[PDB]
Structures are given as C-alpha cells and as structure tokens.
Automatic annotation (TrEMBL):
Keywords carried by this UniProt record: Cell wall, Membrane, Peptidoglycan-anchor, Secreted, Signal, Transmembrane, Transmembrane helix
Protein name listed in UniProt: LPXTG-motif cell wall anchor domain protein
Top-level taxon of the source organism: Bacteria
Membrane listed as a keyword: yes
Protein source organism: Ligilactobacillus ruminis ATCC 25644
Database matches in InterPro entries: Fim_isopep_form_D2_dom, FM1-like, GramPos_pilinD1_N, Ig-like_fold, LPXTG_anchor, SpaA_PFL_dom_1
A Pfam family matched in the record: GramPos_pilinD1
Amino acid sequence: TETATVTLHKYLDGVEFTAYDVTSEYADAYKTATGDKNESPADAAKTASAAVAKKADALQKTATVVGKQTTANGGLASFANLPLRDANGNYKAYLFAETDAPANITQKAEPFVLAMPIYGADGKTVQKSINIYPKNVKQSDKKTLNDNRSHHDFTAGEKINYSIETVVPWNIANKKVYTITDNPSKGLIMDADTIQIEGLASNKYTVKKNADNGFTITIPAANLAAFAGKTLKTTVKGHLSIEDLTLIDTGIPNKATAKVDNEAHHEVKSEEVFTGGKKFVKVDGSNQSKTLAGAQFQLVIVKNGQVVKYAHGNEKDGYTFDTNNTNVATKTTGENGQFEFAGLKYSESLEAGESYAVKEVKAPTGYDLLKDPVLFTVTKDSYKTVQAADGQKISNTKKGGFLP
C-alpha cells in the first residue's frame, strides 16, 4: 500500500513513456557496487542506476511493463501508485524510456533508472510524489571504423571492420522503404557477403552490390516496426584493392547514406584507412649512378635474420603471406633499375621482430647474387613522396675479370 507517484516532464505533449520493473537488475548492480565493503558507498545508487540504464534496449524486451503514459498538460506524464517495495520488502527500481513521439521530434529522452525510496531535501523523509526532468539527446547517423589503433593502415586483401548506425523515425510504419547505401571511396571494396544487422534476420531485407564496389540494403518499412525511434546497427567488412597507384598513402574513407522513402539523411563517413609502399633502385655498389636491369626480387618477411614468410599476390588482388616458397610476388628491373612493392601495411604494424625484405633470386648479368635479403621499412607517406628514381638504392658488386 506504500506507493509513490512519479511525474516526468518532457521538453512538449504527445510523447509516450513506458515504465519497466528492473528490481533484480538494480539489486545485482548495487551488490556489485558495494562488494565486501562494510557499508554501501554514498554513490552506489548512482553507479547502479547507470549500469542498468546502459542495458535499456535489452531490458525493454525482457522487463515487466508497469506503466505507460503519454505527456499531456504541459509535458507531464504521471505514473501513479508505483509500489516502493515488492512482496518480500525489497525496494523496487523502475526504468523509464521514451517509446513513442511525434514524427518531427528530433531529440529523444535518455533512459534513466529510479530506485525506491527517494528522500526530500532533508535526506530523511520519503517522497510520495517525485518530479523527474529526463535529459534529451540527439540521435544521428554515424559510420565508424572499428580498429583499436592510432594508425589505420592495411595491406591489400586484409579485412577492415566497419559499423553503420542510422536512426529509424518514430513513424517508420507510415513508410514504404528504408535504404542504407554504402559508397566506399576509390581503393576500398566492401564485402556485401559479410553484412549483419543487429536484431534483424537476413530474411527481412535484401542486398545488392553496386558498381562502386559498395552496396545498397533495402528494408521494407514494415519490417522495422520494432526499431521505431531507435538506431539500426549494421556491421560489415571491407578491404583495399588498388587499381591506381596515386591512392597509395591517401586516406580512403567509407561512406553511407540512409533514406526513408525518397528523403535522404545527411551522408556520413568513417575515418580514413591507408595502405603503403616502398620504391627501390638496383645499382652498382661501386658506382651508384649506374642502374642495373635484369634483377629479380621477391617480397619476403624476416625475423632473427632468417626468412619466415613469402608474399603472394599484389596491390590489386591482395597479398597473402605463408611458409610456401612458390609463386612469390616477384619484380624485375628494367634499365632504370627501378622496382616497387606497394599495398603494404606499415612496418610498425608487423608482428614482433618482423621486417619486410626483398630477396634477390636473379642477378643482373655480371653481378653477384646478394647472399642475404634486404630489409626495408614502410611508413605513412614513404611511397608517395619518393620519385621512382629516388628510390631505396640496393648495391650490387660487379664480378671481376679473369687472369692467370
């Protein structure tokens, strides 16, 4: 019989709020918050109220609804006679969430948790009627690169992880179609096969690949009933494929646009990814102005001064690495001495103690075959700034003449 009234003030009539019962979840968050401590801390209420608030979306689907009220009379939604206690004298906690609004409303209230009891200004008298002022937040579309590094560099062929987040309006039911159009900048190929959408089975949308190597997701508006006024979470992979060498050491963002019927949302883009390279010149070690033709260099990995891996493929098709010493990515120098490997991730992103190197496997006529591989370093901007003639010199020792 001991109850409290709880009034939410939105700021705007016509906004629905739902009250859910999160007593056990609150309790568990609060037992966590306290631990083996002799008294619960003063701020354990706050800590547990936030921990449960984080799980609002999942709990909206599991937790028992206890009230539902729509704001009227100056933005007031009043939840009356909310019990302070359960049948066994444990104190109730309540999750409040905005669950419907007018179409035009751009700002949604944040879900917040209220555990009973609340005390007045004194800290001693139980409040029998509580007034809450929920904070609003602007939802917005976002595409994000998922890579927990300060440097966003990849070898060609390597998987890149992306997330796409796009808001579903409150009136999604009064709509025909919802489209997510992924447009990757030149160099990045999106892997439509890897698309997943959280809480939305594949039998509820379709996926076409488009000519820019991106894709378009088409979702009938009727299939997104449960996402009204929420954000859709789309994960998808991509990878680099370079058909144009001026893209080496440029930042390549992924991009996506959301559209409800005809009317598009703003475009949004991720952070930029890079691939790298190195340019070389084969020269007489005694006369470096002489470039040498007919050198064959294969791309390897070394650690502890020994060949651990060989490369396979190229900046378009992608590189694999492995202990197989056949069909190795190989280059041949012309008269100008020049060759290059590009589409490689930075040397700093290799595994501990590894380095790239070029092992010679055919020597220019009349020069010695290098006995050991030749280490090199890739970094941001190490391909693009270096003119081919200004490449990393590799020094060959001429074979001498004969005499008795």
